[PDB]
Design a protein around this nucleic acid. Structure first.
Length: 437
RNA sequence: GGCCCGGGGCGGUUCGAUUCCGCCCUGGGCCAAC
């Protein structure tokens, strides 16, 4: 029941079984013939090429090497022609530039056009850097592929594995550079417990130093940070997770946690006990990709959250959730209702000019002096958090992200009470309020 | 699309705004996309 014991059992959840490996070998085999029959210059990259793909995530990456001189237009057109001819079923995908996705003998395949270059300089898109990334990795990761899978499964089970915006976690590539550096999953974990928000891991120089931010320098390009999109809080959760695993190893660290759904009745009671204002802003999800949507959701929550704090509603935390249908921005505040009156600081008494202007304003209550300066009693246009956001969101829609903002400008409502407990947000709310059990 | 740094114009709020809330032009850096 010590680390060694647990990892043996974990490998079973991360390493693909013969029937999954075989399924892939057969797709690769068949895909190679289709490509060779056309005399196409390609290279298999990704975790499939390096047998480091996590169980249940089999997907073959085929990058087509195109002459340096070609125009981006050719790469896409000839690439679209090739993927079309070699796949059982195809579908155009769009990244920095479009490529093709499809299936071959039952397995997911990406046919990506890229430039064939020597020396990282002259990379025109991220996809061009990939070949170099693969080259640097194949000779060094060999032999440690299951250590990579253990790390992938760990991060996945704990909701931090992708590097895309919906996760802001540790990309696959980052995982492999980590194993090449520490040597194994256990060593990465042990040392990770010592990581700070200032850590810098330079793989090429086999060094660790103090920087201005968490920075894992790319072996193929010193100016690039592989963990660039690893959020500060996700970094923190990881570090904390390593301390815990080492303090009490468990196979649970590799098993996805159950949704743990709660009955809305119990949620209602908890919000009651808390005495806070819990509400959400609902609008229609713009028809855009997660990579453009989630950052907008993050911006939206933040701007409204900031409106809540300078307006004295004492917000505790915010959250958000997207469905096929709608989007929700969640909030919990300490103040359900504030007075209409509030004090406004005015000029110091010896300032005859401004004092005169400050008193020239007609107010309902008459200003006073306190500690050498004038203060005025003012009245608010709103006295509840919900009342405030309905105002803010109605006039500041344009600052809530291009798309999300435009969607809220055309429609939005603030839900609270029993009506909120009935939305597909009970999970986000429990995580927001720490609801344990 | 989001984040960072910088320019040129405005609106609102305020006794007082480069300084708070925002809107248009605009230069460069970076991130996700395998």
């Amino acid at each position: 029941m010590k680390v060694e014991e647990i990892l043996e059992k974990a490998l079973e959840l991360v390493i693909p079984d013969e029937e999954e490996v075989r399924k892939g070998r057969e797709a690769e085999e068949e895909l190679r013939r289709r490509l060779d029959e056309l005399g196409v210059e390609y290279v298999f990259v990704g975790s499939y090429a390096r047998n480091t793909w996590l169980k249940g995530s089999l997907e073959i990456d085929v990058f087509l090497l195109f002459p340096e001189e070609f125009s981006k237009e050719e790469l896409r057109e000839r690439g679209l022609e090739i993927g079309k001819a070699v796949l059982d079923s195809y579908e155009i995908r769009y990244a920095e530039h479009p490529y093709v996705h499809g299936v071959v003998k039952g397995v997911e395949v990406d046919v990506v056009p890229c430039y064939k270059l020597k020396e990282p300089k002259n990379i025109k898109s991220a996809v061009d850097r990939t070949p170099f990334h693969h080259k640097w990795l194949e000779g060094r990761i060999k032999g440690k592929e299951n250590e990579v899978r253990l790390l992938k499964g760990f991060l996945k089970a704990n909701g931090i594995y992708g590097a895309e915006y919906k996760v802001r976690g540790f990309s696959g590539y980052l995982c492999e550079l980590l194993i090449v550096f520490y040597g194994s999953f256990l060593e990465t974990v042990k040392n990770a417990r010592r990581w700070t928000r200032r850590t810098v891991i330079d793989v090429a120089k086999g060094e660790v130093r103090k920087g201005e931010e968490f920075f894992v320098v790319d072996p193929v390009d010193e100016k690039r940070n592989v963990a660039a999109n690893l959020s500060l809080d996700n970094l923190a959760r990881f570090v904390h997770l390593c301390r815990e695993f080492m303090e009490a190893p468990s196979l649970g660290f590799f098993k996805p946690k159950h949704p743990l759904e709660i009955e809305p009745e119990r949620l209602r009671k908890i919000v009651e006990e808390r005495g806070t204002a819990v509400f959400a802003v609902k609008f229609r999800k713009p028809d855009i990709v997660d990579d453009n949507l989630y950052p907008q959701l993050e911006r939206a929550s933040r701007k409204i959250f900031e409106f809540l704090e300078r307006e004295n509603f004492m917000p505790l935390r915010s959250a958000f959730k997207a469905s096929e249908e709608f989007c929700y921005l969640l909030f919990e505040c300490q103040i359900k209702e504030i007075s209409r009156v509030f004090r406004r600081m005015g000029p110091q008494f010896e300032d005859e000019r401004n004092v005169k202007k400050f008193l020239s304003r007609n107010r309902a209550f008459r200003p006073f002096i306190e500690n050498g300066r004038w203060w005025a009693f003012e009245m608010r246009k709103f006295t509840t958090p919900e009342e405030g956001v309905r105002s803010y969101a109605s006039t500041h829609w344009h600052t809530l992200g291009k798309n999300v903002g435009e969607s809220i400008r055309e429609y939005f409502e603030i839900i609270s009470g029993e009506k909120l407990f009935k939305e597909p947000v009970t999970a986000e709310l429990c995580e927001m309020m720490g609801v344990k059990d």
